[PDB]
Design a protein around this nucleic acid. Sequence first.
DNA 1: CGGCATACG
DNA 2: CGTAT
DNA 3: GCCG
Length: 327
Amino acid sequence: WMPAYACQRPTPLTHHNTGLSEALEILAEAAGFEGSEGRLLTFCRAASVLKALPSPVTTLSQLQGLPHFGEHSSRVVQELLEHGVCEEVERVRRSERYQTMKLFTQIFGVGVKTADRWYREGLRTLDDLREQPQKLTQQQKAGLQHHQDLSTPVLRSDVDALQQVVEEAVGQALPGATVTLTGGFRRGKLQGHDVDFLITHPKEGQEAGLLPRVMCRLQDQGLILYHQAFERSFCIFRLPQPGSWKAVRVDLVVAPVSQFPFALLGWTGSKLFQRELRRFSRKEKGLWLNSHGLFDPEQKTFFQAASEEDIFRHLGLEYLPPEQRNA
DNA sequence: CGGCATACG
DNA sequence: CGTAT
DNA sequence: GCCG
Ligand SMILES: [Mg+2]
Ligand code: NA
Ligand code: NA
């Protein structure tokens, strides 16, 4: 009844097993902090299975036959159902390792490997990092300076304001170019921690060289607090607020229109949905999927897509709108 | 037991 | 190494 | 950690 891949089932943004999925995603996150990518994936998948269920899990027997629920994930649910709390999950929550790795990895420019190194060096707090700025990259200096603003959720009203300023710059850089909201907001989220935009032009080839022109114009408008030919730009924008402003993470991506459906699909996510979709494509259909295209390694040809609908069809999957890709 | 998505900056 | 879905 |  429950397909094994997340791309085979609708997953809405809000669901009926929130507490259970949030506990499993703690263990997934903790597995990532320890470099256990396989365990992270299983816990992520088990969490996503519960998001896709049509009603609350109330008894352990309801886990029978669900994919990705074995001894470990089932025991987590069992303890939550019986006691409202899972000892392992709570032990992770309060551990100095988990809390510090979470704090460090949330910094823009700090990954698991850097966080882990700092943790081993004895560092624990953001002010610990601020004391030795010579050890920081320019990207990390920016993430740390702006960390407080970047921790405050972005609202959909903020997104509409940002999209207008991006379109203004894009329109000057290349008349006719279009801006599409992607990421979590396209999946229906009301808040987020960053804003994702996909830029193209209806005339194949006209988008070449576009992103530097867009960035130079945003920078000339005083809107760029930070940014690194290129096709992805990871920016910190100055977003106006009442009598002030705040820093917001904004990602700008350009694709040629021939690849737009694949880039839209990839950048709309969720992250787990795209991993599962690419895994399904490769392992069940023998096709290689990325945010540029879909490749048949037998015939050595790329599939032409005019829409996301085309892509789902070429993979033999029922279409899922973005709001049902919240795996 | 091997595999676990796949890019770009 | 970092970033993104 | 789980699946095929
Ligand atoms: Mg996003
Ligand atoms: Na980070
Ligand atoms: Na983003």
